């Protein structure tokens, strides 16, 4: 069976861990969302054929530039993530994550993933961003970024509502 | 805030604190289990029958590179886990204190510096080892007998786990601090523990950066036969420019590989990559002069020089001519030589 290594990268604030826990566990969220997501492998059915999808979190390594690349070799597909309600995390796609990923993995497909979709129309979230003269990232802006970095897909999702969540990992598989 | 609102917030904090304490303990138990698995399924198995593993193509040196000091990491975390368990006995409660345990073990985590600085070499070796049928089968056998299913994460995932784990502690402690109010007895120690474990991660990160610099020089020199003089790491810090040039020294035109470092120029003969040492010049006693296209002299042995220049070793008072393939390549070399001298003289205050 085909084994796929999928590595999730992005700023601390984007909820890489939540997203992976939500995708792999039942009755998410529950009482408490863990800090730790162990390396995970499960058979997933995509377009008829089963695939062994391996999932690798990178949470905690965001400030340690020489440790991060130890995760990258033999990666089949990258999820470069940003939070749709954090413009800073969006800019770091261009400034930090895409350059680094491409340096170590020149030909590996990238999917650009906008997380926290559920908060983009959240009134308190919008208000707090407005206090800083900020606004959430729009779908067109996300498309523009995906084009810029040569992502094979741009996808938006929410770990909490799980809207768009399944599609992210289906397309990750399809990209390989 | 008044007692009603403050009590409400306090219940939340204590509840969430307990969740964090439980995850710290739970994931530490999981981690030690992973370390025990690597020790028993691989190292102990190899140790009990060294001949068999060597016969199958897995050498003693391979094993040292692949697993590094994972057993020393295990011994530290056996102790660490036991210390955590003691603080959280008989089961975690919100008033329990963990801060001092992290502070006590801060220095013990230095073992990670070796492991993380070695892991790139380890994972690259594993890729090559798995190209060997008998070794690939042997490692899969270890995985299986160690309790892994065919669908589980591959060996590389488990070998990466120490890197992943050490970077989780600042995340776990950040959350624990968040749920440890100023009035909580653990408050000062958890604050200090958070900074301690961040410092540990930073130390590991910087050690890797430093080792990468040294290894770049060591690995290059290792490809050079018949080395003369001090090692590159003894007097240099980085390769500035390398390239193939034609060299003339009052004799035949000879193709040579040139290497410019801070403080040193080296030139070699490429073996028919590997090299044969031919010469070196301390850049402090090196001078360079332009040669005009279409000219020739004694040092060029009467050959017409194009895209060329002269190098002068003032210590030996010896000259030779270099020729690049294009004007751009010549400019690149002379720019780099000037730049090396400028930076060296700048450091000299």
Individual helix count of chain B: 13
The strands making up the biggest β-sheet of chain B line up spatially as: 1-5-4-3-2-8-7-6
Shape of chain B: elongated
Strand tally of chain A is 6
Let me know the CATH homologous superfamily of the largest domain in chain B.
Dbl homology (DH) domain
Note the main sheet of chain A: 6 strands, mixed
Approximate strand percentage of chain A: 15-25%
CATH topology category name of the largest domain in chain B: Dbl Homology Domain, Chain A
CATH class division of the largest domain in chain B: Mainly Alpha
Helix content of chain B: 55-70%
User: What is the chains' assembly state?
Assistant: heterodimer
Structural class of chain B: alpha+beta
Structural class of chain A: alpha/beta
What distance separates the N and C termini of chain B?
60 Å
Bin the strand percentage of chain B: 5-15%
What is the H-and-E element order of chain B? HHHHHHHHHHHEHEEEEEEEH
Number of strands of chain B: 8
C-alpha Rg of chain B, in Å? 29 Å
Order of helices and strands of chain A: EHEEEHEHHEH
Family (chain A): Belongs to the small GTPase superfamily. Rho family.
Modified residues (Phosphoserine) (chain A): 71
Modified residues ((Microbial infection) O-AMP-threonine) (chain A): 35
Pfam family, one (chain A): Ras
């Amino acid at each position: 069976m085909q084994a796929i290594k999928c590595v999730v990268v992005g700023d601390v604030a984007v909820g890489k861990t939540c997203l992976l826990i939500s995708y792999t566990t039942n009755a998410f969220p529950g009482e408490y969302i863990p800090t730790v997501f162990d390396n995970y492998s499960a058979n997933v059915m995509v377009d008829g054929k089963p695939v062994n999808l391996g999932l690798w979190d990178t949470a905690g390594q965001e400030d340690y530039d020489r440790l991060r690349p130890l995760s990258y070799p033999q990666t089949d597909v990258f999820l470069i993530c940003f939070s749709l309600v954090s413009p800073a995390s969006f800019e770091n796609v261009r400034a930090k994550w895409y350059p680094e990923v491409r340096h170590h993995c020149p030909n590996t497909p990238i999917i650009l993933v906008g997380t926290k979709l559920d908060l983009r129309d959240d009134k308190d979230t919008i208000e707090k961003l407005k206090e800083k003269k900020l606004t959430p990232i729009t779908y067109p802006q996300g498309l523009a970024m995906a084009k810029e970095i040569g992502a094979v897909k741009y996808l938006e999702c929410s770990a909490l509502t799980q809207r768009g969540l399944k599609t992210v990992f289906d397309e990750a598989i399809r990209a390989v | 805030p008044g007692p009603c609102a403050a009590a409400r917030e306090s219940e939340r904090q204590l509840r969430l604190r307990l969740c964090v304490l439980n995850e710290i303990l739970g994931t530490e138990r999981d981690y030690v289990g992973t370390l025990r698995f690597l020790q028993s399924a691989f190292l102990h198995r190899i140790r009990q029958n060294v001949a068999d593993s060597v016969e199958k193509g897995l050498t003693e040196e391979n094993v040292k590179v692949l697993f590094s000091n994972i057993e020393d990491i295990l011994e530290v975390h056996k102790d660490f886990l036991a210390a955590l368990e003691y603080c959280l006995h008989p089961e975690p409660q919100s008033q329990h204190e963990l801060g001092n345990v992290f502070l006590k073990f801060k220095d013990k985590f230095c073992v990670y510096e070796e492991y993380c600085s070695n892991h790139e070499k380890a994972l690259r070796l594993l890729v090559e080892l798995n190209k060997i049928p008998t070794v690939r089968a042997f490692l899969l056998s270890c995985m299986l007998l160690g309790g892994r299913k065919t669908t589980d994460i591959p060996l590389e995932g488990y070998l990466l786990s120490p890197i992943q784990r050490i970077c989780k502690y600042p995340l776990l402690l950040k959350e624990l601090a968040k749920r440890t109010p100023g009035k909580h007895p653990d408050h000062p120690a958890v604050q200090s523990a958070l900074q301690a474990m961040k410092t540990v991660c930073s130390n590991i990160n910087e050690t890797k950066r430093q080792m990468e610099k040294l290894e770049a020089l060591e690995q290059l020199q290792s490809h050079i036969e018949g080395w003369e003089g001090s090692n590159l790491t003894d007097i240099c810090t980085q390769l500035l420019l390398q390239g193939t040039l034609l060299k003339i020294s009052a004799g035949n035109i000879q193709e040579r590989a040139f290497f410019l470092f801070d403080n040193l120029l080296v030139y070699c003969k490429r073996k028919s990559s590997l090299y044969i040492f031919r010469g070196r010049i301390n850049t402090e006693v090196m001078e360079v002069e332009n040669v005009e296209d279409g000219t020739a002299d004694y040092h060029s042995n009467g050959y017409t020089v194009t895209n060329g220049w002269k190098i002068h070793n003032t210590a030996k008072n010896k000259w030779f001519v270099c020729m690049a393939k294009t004007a751009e390549e010549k400019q690149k070399w002379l720019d780099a030589i000037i730049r090396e001298r400028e930076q060296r003289e700048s450091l000299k205050l």
